[PDB]
């Protein structure tokens, strides 16, 4: 389908918080978020859940305490906006009897023709 | 920039001492610090996380803990097995830095050497050149003196000595001196001897052959 | 069980380059990071780099960016140090190094340690060692052993009895013996009246030059 | 119709919180979350809201007292996405009118034919 | 009303199999979890197994796992253990618990105990006791009995009357008796006066061979 099309909310999201941690973290720590590639690469690294993903963590939140609920809001956020999405799909999935029935119509009528 | 002063370089303290080892930060890094032991030519072994914090497995004699800048780790009651090299860690994935490290030393009482001395190999003489090997086992402090005696003549310049680390349950050392000479001068000669004059001693012990 | 087998090490010549393997063994190596420390012989430790194993991210010292690269193979289930234009300070014994975490990911611990590989960056040619050894004279006081002479570069590996005579064991380290190889002995303490009770051999091991070498020792 | 489309969504949660489970608890809890099937059949268990659901409890958190908002959270976000997936259907199964004239005009046209 | 009745267990011969019955009573089954721990005759208790009846989770003890095997039939309302190459240590009286919570399963209570059954693993067969009276001698002081001899295994439930009498009785312990068998005895003390106004039958059972005896006792 156009799940491709889906991928652009994900990269929207993905900019925004880039965005939020540049504006807070850029002076403090450059090479993390001192531009705005370095924002999108720390909040994937960070989004990974790995190693790396505590390592980022501590020192950000060891200078600014706050930083966590930054971190967590981008992981919630996101990963709500996907659920949601991926619960929306599959109603307007289970909307498709109306289409078996249109393939039914096309049958029959393009037999008339 | 993140420096890590660590003091002092060396200490020596006998066993049941109480060790301390300072750590200076340069800025506030609250917790990061984290204690190494390293034991001679052997892995580190992480001892202290947190600055704080014990890591699973390690003695309780061994504790961390933080005045503002400043780290520190210490032993209560000093074994000798704990003869090792200590390192105090900064922590970061962008960057790592250590300290310079502290070396424990054991002091133990006055301990003489077992002397012995060994000829050279059978099939060493076929290459043309022979070695005497003078052996000190189990002695303290590190400092001794080997003097060697060919034909009751002394060597300079062609002996070399070799020091193993202090041990880890007698806490001692031992002392290997190679004897290089020429398979000429070898056979030109007869009585070899070598003599020991280590602070355990009354008098200086020589060990000797006769080829 | 969880360890850090790490290979690949031994003699380069200058500006030449050396791949050194860290095989992880009984953890989950992606979730964690490798970590490759240095000491050169006579100084404290050094951080070279690090890298998620699963993330990819690396992160590099100032003092061997560019030069060196490091690597992690998830499916290999091994990390990688690549060292390229190799100098004089680089002559050092390097160490695999993990961080496996939810803890230890959040102090940067590093928990666990591999066993340590040398890289000595030199001109001259690799030689095996020579293997002689060290004739007793006579229920204790027994010294005896073999000496390792004129082998280059480090190390010799020595053993008794392939670990089965362990206590009074006291191998030396190398010294230079200016002519330009090392040299070094083992001793070891029995007692005299088991003087044909034991077999005496001592395990020599030399892998630069895979000089495997056994030899008994006996008056 | 598509009701197994659905627990494809439950399974995802089931391994998203099972993966958060494993990274928590794995080294402390090791029967309970050393493995993903580990954390699978213990977070099925405390959904359970059993004897032994309680007994898993209670040592997570009293290692962990944190522990409980993961627990918690698995119930809920399982628990209200079912809620509302479920008043979706009914949302989009109330529009089935359309579908009865459907066949309605199957019949008069099939005679046409 | 809330109990747990167990039954099978008895004589089985070494090597061999033996099934544990509990049925449940009076609460919800499914909601609670079911236990069974173990006591030897001279120790202390021993914890077997665990299950929840609803997930059907089950748990063993290290020194039982795989030889017996805990199971819950929620329709047939009862909690089962299976017990497989039986031995020497197994011989002891085993225990059916439970812990039916929010607030027994927080601290794994265990809140109920059932009442106990033995399980002695032996290779000698079955035999059932022999009944002798034990006779008066004459308001008060009048020692009568019966003695239980020449049975195994164990036990021997003995009452008086149906439970009638009941204040007094000093039913024994069994004893070996080298020959092999168990052999107690049975006493109670009454009024000498009334040697003739109630009947004392002291009514002996032994279920491992279904000997349901019943003697009167009189001078
Ligand atoms: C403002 C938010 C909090 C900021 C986070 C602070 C950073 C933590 C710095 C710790 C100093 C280090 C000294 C060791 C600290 C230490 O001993 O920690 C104990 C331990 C930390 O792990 P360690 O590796 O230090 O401990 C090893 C041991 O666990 C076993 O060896 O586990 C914790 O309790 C983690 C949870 C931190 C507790 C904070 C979580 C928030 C709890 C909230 C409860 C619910 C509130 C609900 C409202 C009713
Ligand atoms: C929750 C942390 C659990 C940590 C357990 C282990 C660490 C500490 C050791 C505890 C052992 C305690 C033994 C004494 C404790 C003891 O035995 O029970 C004392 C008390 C009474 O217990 P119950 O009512 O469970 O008693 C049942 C009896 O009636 C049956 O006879 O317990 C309660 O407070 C129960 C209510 C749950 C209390 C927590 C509910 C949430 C309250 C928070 C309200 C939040 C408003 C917002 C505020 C931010
Ligand atoms: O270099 C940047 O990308 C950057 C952007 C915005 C801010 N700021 O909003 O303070 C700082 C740095
Ligand atoms: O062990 C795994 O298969 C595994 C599962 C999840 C993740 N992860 O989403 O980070 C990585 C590895
Ligand atoms: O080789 C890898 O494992 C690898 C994984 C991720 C990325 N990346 O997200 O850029 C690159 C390499
Ligand atoms: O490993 C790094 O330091 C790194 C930083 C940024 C990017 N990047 O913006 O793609 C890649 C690697
Ligand atoms: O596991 C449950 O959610 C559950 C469902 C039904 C009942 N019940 O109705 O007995 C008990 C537990
Ligand atoms: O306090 C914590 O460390 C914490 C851990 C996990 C979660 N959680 O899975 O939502 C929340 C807080
Ligand atoms: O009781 C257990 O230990 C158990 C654990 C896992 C599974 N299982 O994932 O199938 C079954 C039983
Ligand atoms: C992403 C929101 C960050 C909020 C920062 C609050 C600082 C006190
Ligand atoms: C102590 C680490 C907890 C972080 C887990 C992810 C939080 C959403
Ligand atoms: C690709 C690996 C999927 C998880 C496999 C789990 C095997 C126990
Ligand atoms: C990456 C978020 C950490 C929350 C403590
Ligand atoms: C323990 C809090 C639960 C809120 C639904």
Same mark, same amino acid.
């Given at each position: 389908?156009?799940?491709? !099309?889906?991928?652009?909310?994900?990269?929207?999201?993905?900019?925004?918080?880039?965005?939020?941690?540049?504006?807070?973290?850029?002076?403090?720590?450059?090479? !993390?978020?001192?531009?705005?590639?370095?924002?999108?690469?720390?909040?994937?690294?960070?989004?990974?859940?790995?190693? !790396?993903?505590?390592?980022? /963590?501590?020192?950000?939140?060891?200078?600014?305490?706050? /930083? !966590? %609920?930054?971190?967590?809001?981008? %992981?919630?956020? #996101? #990963?709500?906006?996907?659920?949601?999405?991926?619960?929306? %799909? %599959?109603?307007? #999935?289970?909307? #498709?009897?109306?289409? /078996?029935?249109?393939?039914?119509?096309?049958? /029959?009528?393009?037999?008339?023709? | 920039?993140?420096?890590?002063?660590?003091?002092?370089?060396?200490?020596?303290?006998?066993?049941?001492? +109480?060790?301390?080892?300072?750590?200076?930060?340069?800025?506030?890094?609250?917790?990061?610090?984290?204690?190494?032991?390293?034991?001679?030519?052997?892995?580190?072994?992480?001892?202290?996380?947190?600055?704080?914090?014990?890591?699973?497995?390690?003695?309780? +004699?061994?504790?961390?803990?933080?005045?503002?800048?400043? =780290?520190?780790?210490?032993?209560?009651?000093?074994?000798?097995?704990? =003869?090792?090299?200590?390192?105090?860690?900064?922590?970061?994935?962008?960057?790592?830095?250590?300290?310079?490290?502290?070396?424990?030393?054991?002091?133990?009482?006055?301990?003489?050497?077992?002397?012995?001395? =060994?000829?050279?190999?059978?099939?060493?003489?076929?290459?043309?050149?022979?070695?005497?090997?003078?052996?000190?086992?189990?002695?303290?402090?590190?400092?001794?003196?080997?003097?060697?005696?060919?034909?009751?003549?002394?060597?300079?310049?062609?002996?070399?000595?070799?020091?193993?680390?202090?041990?880890?349950?007698?806490?001692?050392?031992?002392?290997?001196?190679?004897?290089?000479?020429?398979?000429?001068?070898?056979?030109?000669?007869?009585?070899?001897?070598?003599?020991?004059?280590?602070?355990?001693?009354?008098?200086?012990?020589?060990?000797?052959?006769? +080829? | 069980?969880?360890?850090?087998?790490?290979?690949?090490?031994?003699?380069?010549?200058?500006?030449?380059?050396?791949?050194?393997?860290?095989?992880?063994?009984?953890? @989950?190596?992606?979730?964690? $990071?490798? &970590?490759?420390?240095?000491?050169?012989?006579?100084?404290?430790?050094?951080?070279?780099?690090?890298?998620?194993?699963?993330?990819?991210?690396?992160?590099?010292?100032?003092?061997?960016?560019?030069?060196?690269?490091?690597?992690?193979?998830?499916?290999? @289930?091994?990390?990688?140090?690549?060292?390229?234009?190799?100098?004089?300070?680089?002559?050092?014994?390097?160490?695999?190094?993990? *961080?496996?975490?939810?803890?230890?990911?959040?102090?940067?611990?590093?928990?666990?340690?591999?066993?340590? *590989?040398?890289? *000595?960056?030199?001109?001259?040619?690799?030689?095996?060692?020579?293997?002689?050894?060290?004739?007793?004279?006579?229920?204790? *006081?027994?010294?005896?052993?073999?000496?390792?002479?004129?082998?280059?570069?480090?190390?010799?590996?020595?053993?008794?009895? $392939?670990?089965?005579?362990?206590?009074?064991? &006291?191998?030396?380290?190398?010294?230079?013996?200016?002519?330009?190889?090392?040299?070094?002995?083992?001793?070891?303490?029995?007692? $005299?009246?088991?003087?044909?009770?034991?077999?005496?051999?001592?395990?020599?091991? &030399?892998?630069?030059? @895979?000089?495997?070498?056994?030899?008994?020792?006996?008056?």
């Amino acid at each position: 389908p156009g799940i491709a !099309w889906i991928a652009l909310l994900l990269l929207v999201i993905f900019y925004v918080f880039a965005v939020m941690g540049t504006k807070l973290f850029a002076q403090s720590f450059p090479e !993390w978020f001192g531009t705005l590639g370095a924002s999108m690469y720390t909040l994937f690294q960070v989004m990974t859940l790995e190693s !790396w993903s505590m390592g980022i /963590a501590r020192p950000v939140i060891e200078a600014y305490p706050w /930083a !966590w %609920i930054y971190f967590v809001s981008f %992981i919630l956020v #996101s #990963s709500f906006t996907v659920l949601n999405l991926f619960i929306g %799909i %599959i109603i307007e #999935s289970m909307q #498709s009897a109306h289409h /078996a029935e249109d393939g039914e119509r096309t049958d /029959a009528y393009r037999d008339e023709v | 920039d993140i420096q890590m002063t660590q003091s002092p370089s060396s200490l020596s303290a006998s066993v049941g001492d +109480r060790v301390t080892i300072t750590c200076r930060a340069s800025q506030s890094v609250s917790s990061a610090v984290a204690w190494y032991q390293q034991k001679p030519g052997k892995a580190p072994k992480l001892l202290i996380y947190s600055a704080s914090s014990l890591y699973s497995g390690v003695p309780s +004699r061994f504790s961390g803990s933080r005045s503002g800048t400043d =780290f520190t780790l210490t032993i209560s009651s000093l074994q000798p097995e704990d =003869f090792a090299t200590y390192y105090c860690q900064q922590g970061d994935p962008r960057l790592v830095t250590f300290g310079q490290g502290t070396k424990v030393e054991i002091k133990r009482t006055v301990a003489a050497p077992s002397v012995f001395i =060994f000829p050279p190999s059978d099939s060493q003489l076929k290459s043309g050149t022979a070695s005497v090997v003078c052996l000190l086992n189990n002695f303290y402090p590190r400092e001794a003196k080997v003097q060697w005696k060919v034909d009751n003549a002394l060597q300079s310049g062609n002996s070399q000595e070799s020091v193993t680390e202090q041990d880890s349950k007698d806490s001692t050392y031992s002392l290997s001196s190679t004897l290089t000479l020429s398979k000429a001068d070898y056979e030109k000669h007869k009585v070899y001897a070598c003599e020991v004059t280590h602070q355990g001693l009354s008098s200086p012990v020589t060990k000797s052959f006769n +080829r | 069980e969880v360890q850090l087998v790490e290979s690949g090490g031994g003699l380069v010549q200058p500006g030449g380059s050396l791949r050194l393997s860290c095989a992880a063994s009984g953890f @989950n190596f992606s979730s964690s $990071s490798i &970590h490759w420390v240095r000491q050169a012989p006579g100084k404290g430790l050094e951080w070279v780099a690090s890298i998620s194993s699963s993330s990819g991210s690396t992160s590099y010292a100032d003092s061997v960016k560019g030069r060196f690269t490091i690597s992690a193979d998830t499916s290999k @289930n091994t990390a990688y140090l690549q060292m390229n234009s190799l100098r004089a300070e680089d002559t050092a014994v390097y160490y695999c190094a993990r *961080t496996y975490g939810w803890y230890y990911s959040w102090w940067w611990a590093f928990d666990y340690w591999g066993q340590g *590989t040398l890289v *000595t960056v030199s001109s001259a040619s690799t030689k095996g060692p020579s293997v002689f050894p060290l004739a007793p004279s006579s229920g204790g *006081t027994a010294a005896l052993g073999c000496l390792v002479k004129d082998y280059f570069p480090e190390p010799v590996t020595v053993s008794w009895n $392939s670990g089965a005579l362990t206590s009074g064991v &006291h191998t030396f380290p190398a010294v230079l013996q200016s002519s330009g190889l090392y040299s070094l002995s083992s001793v070891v303490t029995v007692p $005299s009246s088991s003087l044909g009770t034991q077999t005496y051999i001592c395990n020599v091991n &030399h892998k630069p030059s @895979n000089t495997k070498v056994d030899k008994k020792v006996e008056p």
